Structures are given as structure tokens and as C-alpha cells.
Amino acid sequence: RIVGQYYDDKTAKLVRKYGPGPRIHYHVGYYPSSEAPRHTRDVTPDAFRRSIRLHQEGLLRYAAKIWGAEHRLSGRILDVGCGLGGGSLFWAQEYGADVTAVTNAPEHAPIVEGFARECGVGGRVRTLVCDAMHLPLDGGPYDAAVAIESSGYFDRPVWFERLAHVLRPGGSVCIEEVFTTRPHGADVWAEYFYTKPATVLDYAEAAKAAGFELVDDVDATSETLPFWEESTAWTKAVLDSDSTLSAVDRRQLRISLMANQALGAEWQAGGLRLGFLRFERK
Amino acid sequence: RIVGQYYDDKTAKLVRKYGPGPRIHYHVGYYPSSEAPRHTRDVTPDAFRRSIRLHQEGLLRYAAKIWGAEHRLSGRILDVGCGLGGGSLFWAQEYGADVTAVTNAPEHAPIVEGFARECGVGGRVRTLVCDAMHLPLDGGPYDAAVAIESSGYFDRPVWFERLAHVLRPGGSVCIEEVFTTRPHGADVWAEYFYTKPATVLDYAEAAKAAGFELVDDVDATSETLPFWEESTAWTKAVLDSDSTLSAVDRRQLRISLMANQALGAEWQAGGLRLGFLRFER
Amino acid sequence: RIVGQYYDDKTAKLVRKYGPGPRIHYHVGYYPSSEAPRHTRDVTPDAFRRSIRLHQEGLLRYAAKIWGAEHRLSGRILDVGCGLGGGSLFWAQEYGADVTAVTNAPEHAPIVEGFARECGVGGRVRTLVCDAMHLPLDGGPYDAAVAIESSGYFDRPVWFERLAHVLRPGGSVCIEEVFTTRPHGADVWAEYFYTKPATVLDYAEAAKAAGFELVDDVDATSETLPFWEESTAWTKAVLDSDSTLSAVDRRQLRISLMANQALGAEWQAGGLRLGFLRFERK
Amino acid sequence: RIVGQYYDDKTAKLVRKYGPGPRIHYHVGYYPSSEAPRHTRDVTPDAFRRSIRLHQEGLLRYAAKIWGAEHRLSGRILDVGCGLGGGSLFWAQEYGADVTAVTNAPEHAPIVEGFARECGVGGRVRTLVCDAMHLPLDGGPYDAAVAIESSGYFDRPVWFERLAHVLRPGGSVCIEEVFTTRPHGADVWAEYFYTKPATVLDYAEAAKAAGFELVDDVDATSETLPFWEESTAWTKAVLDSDSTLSAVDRRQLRISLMANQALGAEWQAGGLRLGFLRFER
Amino acid sequence: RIVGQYYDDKTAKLVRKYGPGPRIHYHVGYYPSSEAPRHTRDVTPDAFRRSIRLHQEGLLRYAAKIWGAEHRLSGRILDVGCGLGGGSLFWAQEYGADVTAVTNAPEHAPIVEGFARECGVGGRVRTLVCDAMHLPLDGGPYDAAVAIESSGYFDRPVWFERLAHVLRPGGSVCIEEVFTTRPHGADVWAEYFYTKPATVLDYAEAAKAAGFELVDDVDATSETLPFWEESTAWTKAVLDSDSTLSAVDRRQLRISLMANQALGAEWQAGGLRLGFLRFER
Amino acid sequence: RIVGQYYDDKTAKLVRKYGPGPRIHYHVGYYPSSEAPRHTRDVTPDAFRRSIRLHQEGLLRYAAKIWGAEHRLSGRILDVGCGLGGGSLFWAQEYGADVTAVTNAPEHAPIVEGFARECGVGGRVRTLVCDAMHLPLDGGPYDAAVAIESSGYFDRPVWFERLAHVLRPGGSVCIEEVFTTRPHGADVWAEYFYTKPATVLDYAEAAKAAGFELVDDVDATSETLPFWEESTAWTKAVLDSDSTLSAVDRRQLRISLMANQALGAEWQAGGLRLGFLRFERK
Ligand SMILES: Nc1ncnc2c1ncn2[C@@H]1O[C@H](CSCC[C@H](N)C(=O)O)[C@@H](O)[C@H]1O
Ligand SMILES: Nc1ncnc2c1ncn2[C@@H]1O[C@H](CSCC[C@H](N)C(=O)O)[C@@H](O)[C@H]1O
Ligand SMILES: Nc1ncnc2c1ncn2[C@@H]1O[C@H](CSCC[C@H](N)C(=O)O)[C@@H](O)[C@H]1O
Ligand SMILES: Nc1ncnc2c1ncn2[C@@H]1O[C@H](CSCC[C@H](N)C(=O)O)[C@@H](O)[C@H]1O
Numbered sequence A, C, F: 001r002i003v004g005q006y007y008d009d010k011t012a013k014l015v016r017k018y019g020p021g022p023r024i025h026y027h028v029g030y031y032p033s034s035e036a037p038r039h040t041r042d043v044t045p046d047a048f049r050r051s052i053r054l055h056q057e058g059l060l061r062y063a064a065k066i067w068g069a070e071h072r073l074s075g076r077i078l079d080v081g082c083g084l085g086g087g088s089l090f091w092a093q094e095y096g097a098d099v100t101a102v103t104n105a106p107e108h109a110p111i112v113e114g115f116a117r118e119c120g121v122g123g124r125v126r127t128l129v130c131d132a133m134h135l136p137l138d139g140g141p142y143d144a145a146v147a148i149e150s151s152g153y154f155d156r157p158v159w160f161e162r163l164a165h166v167l168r169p170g171g172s173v174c175i176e177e178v179f180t181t182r183p184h185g186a187d188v189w190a191e192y193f194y195t196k197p198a199t200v201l202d203y204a205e206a207a208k209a210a211g212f213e214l215v216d217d218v219d220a221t222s223e224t225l226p227f228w229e230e231s232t233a234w235t236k237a238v239l240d241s242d243s244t245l246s247a248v249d250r251r252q253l254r255i256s257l258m259a260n261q262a263l264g265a266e267w268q269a270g271g272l273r274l275g276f277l278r279f280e281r282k
Numbered sequence B, D, E: 001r002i003v004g005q006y007y008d009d010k011t012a013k014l015v016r017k018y019g020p021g022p023r024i025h026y027h028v029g030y031y032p033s034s035e036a037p038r039h040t041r042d043v044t045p046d047a048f049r050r051s052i053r054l055h056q057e058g059l060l061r062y063a064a065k066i067w068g069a070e071h072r073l074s075g076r077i078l079d080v081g082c083g084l085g086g087g088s089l090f091w092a093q094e095y096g097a098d099v100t101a102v103t104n105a106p107e108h109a110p111i112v113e114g115f116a117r118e119c120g121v122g123g124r125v126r127t128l129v130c131d132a133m134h135l136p137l138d139g140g141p142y143d144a145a146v147a148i149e150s151s152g153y154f155d156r157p158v159w160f161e162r163l164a165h166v167l168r169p170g171g172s173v174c175i176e177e178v179f180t181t182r183p184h185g186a187d188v189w190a191e192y193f194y195t196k197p198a199t200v201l202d203y204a205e206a207a208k209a210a211g212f213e214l215v216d217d218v219d220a221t222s223e224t225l226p227f228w229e230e231s232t233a234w235t236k237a238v239l240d241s242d243s244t245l246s247a248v249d250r251r252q253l254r255i256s257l258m259a260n261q262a263l264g265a266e267w268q269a270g271g272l273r274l275g276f277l278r279f280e281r
């Protein structure tokens, strides 16, 4: 949709906040203690940035553990909604996977190829720019598909049909996602990020219809709540310190801070769930 | 500047929220009991817009009370940052004043003029598409200048210099504004609305250096804090009610809700003051 | 020349620094004690701005005194190199003069008409945009011409010929200007402002050739030196306080500060002279 | 950004001052006795350019001494902010290094390549027109990275993160830069050259957070202060010598003289430090 | 407090420097041409003491001019921090005023009284050994209060509160003092003389909160800077002239010279202002 | 004299400024480059303190070098005017000397015994509290005497007679001292510190009378000038940072700063000399 233009235009802010390096993640970070680190020695934007980065990697490491990526994500896999390729390179390098990276933000694909060349995995990571519900996917059967915080953009009934045609029997669909637990329980997240979160039931119903079984359903809501404290704290540090900010840039950072507070309030209100689902194709 | 274009762009989203009147207002509302009305069983967008418009009108009635608009605001006045003309029309109609309405949003100028005719005061209300800190003084001396929530956009020293030359001696400068009470006290407000809020002392110093005497200072922070609850409710009523909203306007509305939530929290955090000021030349 | 484009493009900085109001001056200020005021209660940019403005008006008041503007500048006069009209309105209002305001910066003429309307002298102040050495000047004989800090842009032999045709006998040419006293003694001023300052002899030679006599020659170098301290101090205050400055705006202010220091050093090196000349047409 | 365009624009005024070589350098000179040569009876522009170029070359010789470029700077290195390639060529020729020269001025990239061929090291020197804080890591691990007067343009935390991924363990990061020694100590330098200078501690903190160890810190403020006297003299020699200078370029030269005068004063005011740093991964 | 004892201790070293008069003054001198007299071929301690005493007297004559002591300082006044009574006697004799002289140095009170008799105004000059911020109001309303170089020792808010109750409406408060013009601008002065100097704004704020209006503000920094040269010269003339000085008093004199040298440097550094202020109740 | 009471009472300030540890020096520091170090990373009082301490040790190391302490100061020696024992322990430990430490400040002797016990040299360092010109010195002939910045307190004719009786033939008198080169050229130093500096001629005349020859005369004025910059800078840092200072303590620090500036000005005025003399007994 317009979401590809919305993801295009914030390329600059993502590299500012979640860069640099070759692996830039754009998803919430995982704090296995449900507590944000205390930042004392160093309260500059770069301190929160590196802490956000490290715990965003912690999210991937945690997922590969509970999903047993050693055998389930080491083969030929789809990285649906790849962002800037942080996840894509993570599977390619940590588990040797051959990755097809999918995005509807064209500005992003060349960045992912750059970063893959960079780490030397350009022969095992490929991008393609299309909608993930209409994608023609040459590349034979894939052993798995991973969606880190992108399935909220998808039509789930139709998306799971798509994956049923391109995933071999017994292949996995691994989803990290914001879900509702009550109705409207993720509205702040939904309206601000142009997503349409549903319940875990909705995902399971749509996946069952296309021939997938739910084999794992993990609640990481409490372990990802600290991400909003760090995300907020970073935004405050930039506003507080950098005096080269134009009035326009300063207002976007302000709007980002205002949103991070309302998102963090929602996260703990009990109406949403940060989940890790894994489906197996029947 | 980019602000004048920023006001141009939000003309439609702002007639939706605060229209249609012939008076559309773009300032916080004044709730004299310092609490929003409990909204009954009608919690639709129009129920809240009507309440927002009501207390927006009340803010001007209250300003007119404490300023004694009978004598001070009933002559040849500048409406500096007229928005969509709601304040301009107010002074023309309720106090028989002749009003020159200044803005840097050129799209808003026709709207103020069209509404001036439909009220039959088009012969008492002209517009000036210019910067407030470069005001044409041809147009003779003015009796007073009123700035309802616009002066956070101004270079106060320079603006008061301009006012010192266009305003007769004893002329009043009537200001409603968000001021700081401490450093960084209005940062959400400042960074979201593209303003540079300053303290009351800052304003009095700049006015003095241009020959102006601060003669009145009222704190109305408590009475305007409920505006954020009604403004937040209206936004929720829209996201909740109409499922024929495009994803793009649904996301803009969402961002406004997060903003209103951050803005109202800062309104009560202590660092900010919604104030009413009057200077005399 | 290109000087009109150079004067056009700094319209923004002049209003920032020497505005607002209706009378914006762009010339050095006059401090009759040869001492800059001590700024203590208020060291914000607006304090220095108002002090610069007030002493720039002091320059005009001082000039009208030593030039006896009551009879010499109350008639029909040429304001050559009018800037933004500060001088022009000053003669029009203080002494009732009918002013023809001349500039080679077209962006500036509409600003001067605006300010003249503003003060109600639009029937007694007119602009025309041309080079001051090729100007066709309808408007009969003029009783005087005033040039506040503009004659450094002119060919003096040719300019004085021009004034000899349009000034009645016994009319005055009033010049405030930077002059050299030694060779190269105004080079910092000259190269930075695109002027060509000469000596007082050079001016007198060129004016004698076209039929003018030098009747007054005043040295205001010491009374205008404090202007550089205030001009510098303002520039520092803006840089020090305003945190909305872009890197580009901050570098121009820095470059302005660097120039104000070198100009202030030149001013006192003994090589230049801030002069007030008055010539009478023979 | 606007900086990369700002470097594009001054290509001609900078080949005039520091060319023609095949090595053109755009960093201060190093005067080991901390004083400029007394210039004899030849005080022409070329006399000063030759002296400027001499000590610019000496700065790289001195950096190569204290860094031991024999082993640390003789492999596959990044030349981050290569200017017109003078430093790049230096490492290729004097230390038999293979050099990838990074800039954000696209006009400068052909000039660096052309000069790499004319020296016969075009097979040891490639260019990368990109931002330094988004460096292509395809191109294998590098031995070291050198930044002569470019890092004031960088986001140091982010830049060191990028370096942590492109540089082998034990790889060196060699920096010559203007640092602050106190707040606002390099403001003339910063506001004129579009940099954000920071202290040595700032640099070590950002390097640490990316796994880098500060292993060397040399103060060369005294030895580089005369550069401003030679740079100022050159400019004066040009304004003084050639009367076939257009008013526009005569005014640009004049502004550079006022700048050099303000820059050299700040160099001795205490608030700034011209330093040489080396980090190890 | 310890200050009142600190004034007690320097009674002899201060009669030596500024005596014997019947008027001994302990404030800087006022040099109307802003330069010390060139001292001829007599450069003895008494030559300089005479010059110091001369311009100390002139400071009070000048204060009396700008304050119009004819009407404002010729009634029932407080001399707050009277020192050794030189200012007290001045107002009694030159302006026919009745003076209540306040100090916290109990040793100084007899000296002020003895000198009041020897001038024949002992019936117009009484003393009050107390703290200035706890003044006995029994003694009826006063016409004015004058504080020559004593108010740096006061809690200004509290002091002005006390003044608001002892001074009739329209009563004047006349102050000569070292003020700051910027933070830390009078630190040598403050730390050596045990004062807490504040800005002129600080003083006006505290006076306002007690119902006082600042009506006059004169800067006399230039005219009092030579005092430090004469005060330094006097000290040198003493160390140089008399070889029957004990090592202990020779070291005290030496320390005073280093102090005067540091004090006079700070007087011209910009951070300080010797000012004359008048408030009206 | 009263000088012992003056040295007693500033025990507190010396430990604050030149402590802690076991070796506290009270003499100027030696900067072999004639340049004070640039303090940038750390401008707290402790940075200047440690730099002052290190260069005060540098003074002793420099003296032992030019005096060849390996054989001239390793034997049984007098440390006249020992301060808090910094010099005394330095000879005892670095060259194995047996030290008799002399002072007229009794508060100081127990501090020196404490510090000697501390370093384990209590059997080779002894204090005695008396005037250095009337001292009965049991302890046989001494091989040398050292006076670091104390001889300014002594009657030189009489003091050298004293040393002639207690020093074996060929023994050394090693003096570090402020000397005048012009008359009054050390007055600031003299009056502030209760010393009576004389010229090098005066010292040589008095030492010749008691049977000593001047064999070495070194000018260290330029190498010790940076000490005043550091001493001043420390005093400023304490005043600037510590907010627990009483008004009385703050005024003494101020008075100290005022003195350090006038002492530093004197040091470079050309009227005084920081000298290292060595005399040999005939
Ligand atoms: N309709 C659609 N089809 C394909 N990709 C989409 C899409 N809508 C959104 N996306 C992509 O989904 C991603 C959401 S955030 C990126 C997530 C990334 N895997 C990470 O965690 O690092 C973006 O890359 C966005 O471009
Ligand atoms: N620089 C500028 N010059 C003139 N008007 C400006 C301005 N910057 C902002 N404004 C105007 O000031 C107004 C701010 S909000 C509108 C306030 C209006 N009185 C009301 O209460 O409805 C807008 O009209 C905006 O366009
Ligand atoms: N060749 C030329 N012909 C006419 N005007 C010129 C000119 N060159 C420069 N000027 C004008 O001379 C002025 C110099 S500064 C403006 C001076 C003004 N009178 C004041 O003091 O307020 C500018 O207005 C500039 O546009
Ligand atoms: N963001 C950025 N990314 C990459 N290079 C940059 C940059 N910003 C500035 N630079 C480059 O850094 C250099 C700064 S000055 C040139 C330094 C060069 N080593 C020499 O001494 O000659 C310029 O080449 C400039 O274009």
C-alpha cells in the first residue's frame, strides 16, 4: 500500500536510531529479566542506541533458540518484511540460511544487498520488492518463513495460503508479532504503525485453513516492555543534547517521544501481547 | 516560513475538528470550573466538537472580560495570527471593533474574508498575508493588538518593536499563550507545534525594550487543562466511529491522539503556564 | 554589478540583525563617547540589537546636526544607496524631505515603499532601482543628495558628474563613508563588502572636477569604533543562545563574527577613517 | 549531505591553494619547531603554497612515524574522507598499502582516481562515493582506517560501529582531528567548516562502545598553529599580487582571510586541541 | 558574625591606612577623571594616604550630588555599616542630618561616638551595635538609609524587609556597592572581604518584594579603578620606607599588596560593577 | 621565630594541596621543558595536585642528578628545613641516606616520623625541632647537608659557620633556593613567605667565610615557572568546584590565588632566580 512509501521515507530515522553497522534491526528488543538496564555512566543517545541494538539482537537470538533455528532456519527460508536486513543477515550468518528478503519499501532492498555484500553473504541473501500477499516466488519449496513484526501488515487468511504453496510439508512459519488479547487492545500500535493486529486465534484460524498447525505459542509481552523505556530514553537524550536540530526534526522527535509513551502505556495495559508463534505446514 | 506552509496543510483537518461555524477557533478551550463536562450517552465526534467549540468561544469571552474589551478591544485592532478568523470575527461582532487580521498562511486569508461577509462585518475585517514581524504600518495607528496562541511563533523583541510603531500610546497588547515556567517546560508543545515558548519575564523584558508596560498577568493553566481531555476524546470518537477512514488519515488521527496525550501530561507537569497578559504602550 | 545580488541575498540577515520596525539601518553606529555601552542586566541578542539600532539612529541625528538638515536636507533630496529605507524615512519624517531612494538591489525597493506607506510618508518617498552612476533621474533639480555608506560602491569622478547635472547650484552632497588614510588601510572593509574606499583627497578631486567644493570634513573614526564591539557581541549572543540554528546558519554567523573582529581590528589600526563630508555645488 | 555539496563547490578554490601535485592535501600543516619559516624576499602566492604543501606532507610523514605506518598502515586500509586523495596516494606510495578512499563529494572521486593512475598506483587505490557512516563492508576486512581531519564530520558512535565490522581484530584506527578541550572551544572551526568537534574522551567512549581501545594520544596544537600564519599569508599574497581578480573571488578570498584570522586566534586560545589518536580493535 | 570579629581585628591596620581624621573612611575612592594623580617626588606613605582619603571623601561628595542629599539625606537616617564613622560624620556635618550608625563591630562603636563629639555633632549621631538584618525599629521612622560598601554583607531580601518597616513611605535607600555583572565576577572581592556580591537585578528584586522602587542606577567602575593603584602604591610605600616593621606586619602588608593586585585586576576584567543605587519606598 | 608558628598553622593546607601519601613536598616543581602540562581530560583539583606532586618529585630527582646523590647524598646527611619529610624520605629511600630532619615547626616532626615508620625508614630518618642556626647537632660529622627552599629563613654567615663544624672536609652543602638577581627582585616572595632572599654572591661570601667553595651554580628559573600556573590552576579548581567551602576557607583560597598570581608575575620579571647551589667544605 502507502505503507511502502511510509517505510521508504523513514529510512533516514531508522539508520539514525538503529544503525549503523551492517545489521540494523527494526523490531522491539528482548530483555529476559523484564527490566530495562540502568544507564548511569553514559546517558548519551549512543548509549541507549547500543543497548537497543544489543537487545534487538537478543530478540533474534531468543527466537532462534525457541524455534531451534539450527535445523529449522538453516535451510532455504523466506524473510518476509525484512526491514533493512538485520534479521536477514542474522539467519544467513548465524545459521547459514539462504534468504529471500521481501519488502514493499523499494528504497530498502538496495540497502540490504549492500549489507549482505558487506558481510560476505551476498550469494546467500536475495531481495525482492513486492507485496507479500501477491508475491510470485520462484525458488522452489522453501524450508521455512520468518516474519519479525511484519505480519501485522498482511491479510492473514490470504498470506498463509501463499505460504502453503511455497513451503514444503513440515516447514515452519515463525512469527514474532503484536497481537490483541482484548478488542482494541493494540489500537495505539495499530493506528500509529498502519498495522492491523489480530488475536492469536485469528492467526491460527487462517493458518489452519491453509494447512498449518500451531505448535508453539510464547508470551514475550513482559520481556519486551523495557524496549519502550529505552526507545523513549534515547529520543529524550537526542532532544536534550543535540543543538543542531532543526525545528522540524525536533518536532518529529517530540512526536516520536509522545508516541513511545502512549505505546509503552498500551503495552502494559493488558490489551496486547508480544507473541512468538511457530506454525508447521501439514 | 515552513510554519506558514505547515498551517496551510492542516486547513482541512482543522475545519473538520473545529468547524464549521462562521467562527472556527484554533486555541485551547477555557473551562471555568477546571473540569470537562461529563459527556452523557452521546459520545460522538460531533458531541465533542460542539463542546470544544463551546469552550473555545468561552476563552475569548473570558479574555474579553479580563481585558475589558468594551473599551480596549472595540477600536482599530490587529488580530495577529488570526488562524481561520474565529477570533477576528469575535471582536468585530461582539465588540464592534474594526479588525485587521494578520496571518502567514495565505490559504487561510480567503476563508477569513468569506466568513467576514457571511457575518456582515466584511466591511470591518480585512486580512494581511504577511509575517507578523514585518507588519505594514500603512493603515494608520491601531488601538490594540490581540494574539491568541500565536506569539509562540514570534521573535518577541522584534515583534514588540513593530508593535511600538503601529500602536498608539496607551494601546493595549493582549496575549494568550503557552509560557514556560522553567527550562524545557513546554518542549512537547514547542516541538510539536513549531513554537519557541518563553517565560513571562522574557515577554515583559522584550515589551519593555520597545516601550511597553506589563499591566496584567492571569494564570489559566487549570482552566485549560480539560481541553486536552475533550480534544483527546474527540479524536478517539473519530477513530472509533467511522470505519470509512483511509489508513493514511487513520494514522494521522492516531498520531494526534498520542500527541494530545503527551501534550496534556506536560500541561500538568508544572513546567508550563497557559497565561493571559496585557501590555500598555 | 553583482553587488545588487549580494545586497538582495542578505535581506534576511539585515532584518534579523537590524530590524524590525519601519526604520532598518545598515551603517555603523555613532557612540559620541567613543565607548561601547556596558551591557549587564540583559545580554541577549535583542539587547545588542536595540543598542545597535539606537546608535545607528544616533549616526543619522549626528549627521543632520553637523549638516544642518533643517535647511539643507528638508527639500527635494536624493538618498543614494538607500538600503532598506532607514535613512530615507529619517529625512522624510524628521525634516519633511521629499526623498528619491536609489538602490541596485531590487528586492529592497518594495520593502522601502512598504515602510514608507507604514509611516505615512509614501507621498514623500519614492524608490528607483538602477545603478547610481547611470541613473536617469527625472524630478527636476534636487536640493541635496545623501549617501550613507554607499559611495564606496561608486565611481567617484563619474558619480559627481551625475550629481552636478541634477543638483541646483549651492546644493549639498552629504557623504558618510569609510576612507583610507594610508594605502590598503581599509582592505578588510573593501574586500569583505565589495567596496573600493579611497582617500578624502580622491573624493575632493573628483568632486572639484564636476564643480563641487568641500566645505566640511569630520573624523568620526573613534566615535564609530564601538559599533564593532556591539556588532560582534550580538553575533556571539545569537550563536551562544539560539539552539534552533542550522549548521549552515551557524557557520554564517561564525563567519560574520570572524569578519567583525578583523574589521574592528582594522578600524583602530590607523589606516582607515570614518568620515562625514559635505560638498556644495558651484 | 549539504557538506558533501559544500566540498564539491570548493574544488577549484582548493586546487588553486593546495595543488597541483598529484598529491593535493586538505589538512593543516605540521611545523616541528612550532614556528613558520621566515619567508625571505620571495613572498609570492606560490612561495607560500609551496611551504603550505611542504608541511602538509610533513604532517603525514609525522603521523606515519608515530603510528609506525611500516606495519600498521601498509595493508588494506580505509582512507575515510580522502579529500582530493593526497593522503590516499601517500599511503599507497610511501608504505606500499592498498587504499580504499571514502568521500561524500562525488566530484572529488574522479580526481583521486586520475591521480592514482598518474602515480602508477591506480591498481592499489579505489574510491567509494558514500557516507562514512554507511560503509560497504563487501570488500573484505581491512587492516586499518585512517581519518586525517575528516572525523569532525562523523557520528563517532555510529562510525566506530561501522569500523568494528569492517576492521580485523587488532586493526588500527588512526585519527588526526581538531578536538575540544572545553565547551565551545572550537566554535569558529565548527561553524565555518560544518563540523561537530568533540573531546578526546568523547572519541574514546564511542570507540569503546564499539570494541576499540585508545592506545595513543599526541597533542600537536603547537606544531600546527603556524599553518594559520602561512595560510593567512598565502591569502594576502593573492589579494596583493593579482589585479586580474574578479570582485566576487576577491571577496571570497577576503572572507577566507578574516576566517583564517579568527581560526588562528582560536587555535591559541586554549579551548581547542589538534591531536593524533590511534585505537586498536 | 565571624565578620563582625573580622572587622574588630583590622581596626589598627585600618586607622593606620585611612586615619586619622575625625573622619576615617573604609570604601574605595572616586576619581572623577578615571585616573590616579601622578604622584610627584613625594611618594611616601603619607602622600598616598592623603590622596586615598581625598578621593574617599570625594566618593561621598559625589554620592551626595547624585542622591541630592540636600533633601533626601538631611533628616533622620540610618548609616548601615558605618565603618569607623566617616560616612556617618559626613552626613551629620555636610547635610545637617541626624544619623543612627549601625555596625556589628562593637570595637568600632566607641570610635564613632568619640569622633562625633570631637566634631560637635555627638548630639546628632548615635550608634547601634547590632546586626543590620535585625534592626531595632524603636527609634521611630527614618527618612533614609545609606549603605556605602556594606550591603555585600547583607541578606538583601531580609534587609529590605527590615528597611520597609523602619523607613517612611517615599524614604530613600542609597547604596554604593560592588555588584556582579556575570557569575563569579567578584570572587576575589567576595572571598577576600567575606561578602556575597549579587547583581543589580538581584538587589531590585529583593527591594521590590519589600515594597521598594529602584529609581537610580549609576555605574562608577571606571572612576573607582584607580583606588586600587593608590591603595597598592601606599602599601608599597610602607614596605619600602620603614625598616622598623616586624616580620609579622611586614607579611600582612605583603599579603594586602598581593590582594590589591588581584582585586584591581578583577575590577577591570569586566565581571564586576561598582555601582550607586537609590530605591524609594 | 614566629615562622615556626606560621609553618605549624598551615599544616592543614599543605596536606590538602600537596598530600596525601607518605611523601608530601613543599617546594616548587621542576618542569624540564619550561612549559606547564596541558590539562584537558581532567581539570579537577586532584589533577593539578598530582601534577604538582609529580613535578615536585621531579625537582628532587633533578637535584640528585646534578648533585650526584649516589655518592654525595647517600651517607649521613642533614635535611635542614625538612617540611613534612618529603625530601627526607626521598634521600633515605632513593639513596639510602641516614637523615637528620630539622625543623622549627614542632607540629611537623611527628608527621615526619609517622611517614618514615610508614615507608620503613624510621631507623634511618630522625627529626629534631630547633632553630637551624642554634641547633646542637650530636651525630658526629655529617657527609652533607641539603636545604630545599629553607635557607631563605637562615642567617647565611652564621648558618655556614654551623655547617663547617658538623660537616667533614669535602662534604657538600646542597641548596635549592630563591635568590635575588636585582635588589628587591624577590620582594613578593620574601614578604609573603617571611623569607630574606639574597644574591648568589651573598651566599658565596658567607660560605667562603666559613670555609666552603662554590662548585656548582645552576639556573632553574625557567624550569620552575610552570609551577605557578599549576599552583594557581589548582587553587581555582578548588574554589570553582567544592561547594562545601566556608566563607573563611574560600577567602584564604582566594588570598592564595591572588598571591600565586603576583608570585608568578615576579618569577618572570627577571629580578629573581631559582637556583641550585652546591658548596664543598675546605
Ligand atoms: N504489504 C507488505 N508486503 C511486504 N512487506 C511489507 C508489507 N508491509 C510492510 N512490509 C515490511 O515489513 C517490515 C516491517 S518492520 C521490519 C521487520 C524486520 N524483519 C526486522 O525486525 O528487522 C518492513 O520491512 C516493511 O517494509
Ligand atoms: N510568522 C508568523 N506571522 C504571522 N502569523 C503567523 C506566523 N506564524 C504563525 N502565525 C499564525 O498564528 C496563528 C497561530 S494558531 C491561530 C490562533 C488564532 N487566533 C485562533 O485562536 O484561532 C496561525 O494563524 C498561524 O498561521
Ligand atoms: N552601484 C550601486 N548603485 C546604486 N546603489 C548601490 C550600488 N551599489 C551598492 N548600492 C547600495 O548602497 C547601499 C549600501 S548600505 C545602505 C546604506 C543606507 N543608506 C543606510 O545606511 O541605512 C545598499 O542599499 C546597496 O544596495
Ligand atoms: N559524511 C561524510 N562521509 C564521507 N566523507 C565525508 C563526510 N563528510 C565529509 N567527508 C570528507 O572528509 C574530508 C574532510 S577534509 C579532507 C581530509 C583529507 N584526508 C586531507 O587531509 O586532504 C573531505 O573529503 C570530505 O568530503
Ligand SMILES: Nc1ncnc2c1ncn2[C@@H]1O[C@H](CSCC[C@H](N)C(=O)O)[C@@H](O)[C@H]1O
Pocket: E001, E003, E004, E007, E024, E025, E026, E027, E080, E081, E082, E083, E084, E085, E086, E087, E102, E103, E104, E105, E130, E131, E132, E133, E147, E148, E149, E150, E153
Ligand atoms: N551583618 C552586619 N550588620 C551590621 N553591619 C555590618 C554587618 N556586616 C558588616 N557590617 C559593617 O559594614 C561595614 C562595611 S565597610 C565600612 C563601610 C563604611 N560606610 C565606610 O565606607 O567607611 C563595616 O562597618 C562592617 O562592620
Ligand SMILES: Nc1ncnc2c1ncn2[C@@H]1O[C@H](CSCC[C@H](N)C(=O)O)[C@@H](O)[C@H]1O
Pocket: F001, F003, F004, F007, F024, F025, F026, F027, F080, F081, F082, F083, F084, F085, F086, F087, F102, F103, F104, F105, F130, F131, F132, F133, F147, F148, F149, F150, F153, F154
Ligand atoms: N629558622 C628555622 N630553623 C629551622 N627550620 C626552619 C627555620 N625556618 C623555617 N624552617 C623550615 O624550613 C622549611 C621551609 S619549606 C620545607 C622544605 C622541604 N625540604 C621540602 O621542600 O619539602 C619548613 O620546614 C620550615 O619549618
